[PDB]
Write a protein that binds this ligand. Sequence first.
Ligand SMILES: *[C@@H]1O[C@H](CO)[C@@H](O[C@@H]2O[C@H](CO)[C@@H](O)[C@H](O)[C@H]2NC(C)=O)[C@H](O)[C@H]1NC(C)=O
Ligand SMILES: *[C@@H]1O[C@H](CO)[C@@H](O[C@@H]2O[C@H](CO)[C@@H](O)[C@H](O)[C@H]2NC(C)=O)[C@H](O)[C@H]1NC(C)=O
Lengths: 49, 45
Amino acid sequence: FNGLTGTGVLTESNKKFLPFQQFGRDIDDTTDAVRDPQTLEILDITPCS
Amino acid sequence: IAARDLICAQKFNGLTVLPPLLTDEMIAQYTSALLAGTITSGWTF
Ligand SMILES: *[C@@H]1O[C@H](CO)[C@@H](O[C@@H]2O[C@H](CO)[C@@H](O)[C@H](O)[C@H]2NC(C)=O)[C@H](O)[C@H]1NC(C)=O
Ligand SMILES: *[C@@H]1O[C@H](CO)[C@@H](O[C@@H]2O[C@H](CO)[C@@H](O)[C@H](O)[C@H]2NC(C)=O)[C@H](O)[C@H]1NC(C)=O
């Protein structure tokens, strides 16, 4: 997504990103949510098993 | 309590937390048995 790489499972989410905000963070300073630049829908990331 | 969670202890990079061998109910049963035994029998049990 938009240059940043990663691996995992994508799921639909219902978070409250501000209009200028692109992605999310976590207590472990790791990516936890993204906003795809085609439909502007919040997306949640789950690690592999 | 870990009842409905889909085993989500692992955190994104080779880090896992293992559950204890003895669940809390077993520990509670042990304490109850000790306390009932010491109430009824004394030290002879
Ligand atoms: C970027 O993404 C697509 C690229 O074509 C477009 O969005 C969709 O466009 C179709 C028409 O081709 C519409 O039927 C959809 O409703 C559009 N989707 C959305 C979410 O609007 C458009 O060019 C761009 N979309 C956005 C949201 O910027
Ligand atoms: C593994 O994942 C499955 C997903 O299907 C879990 O199944 C759920 O089981 C409960 C109780 O039987 C149901 O109420 C849910 O509806 C089921 N999930 C779905 C999506 O239908 C299963 O519990 C999971 N196992 C563990 C140990 O987490």
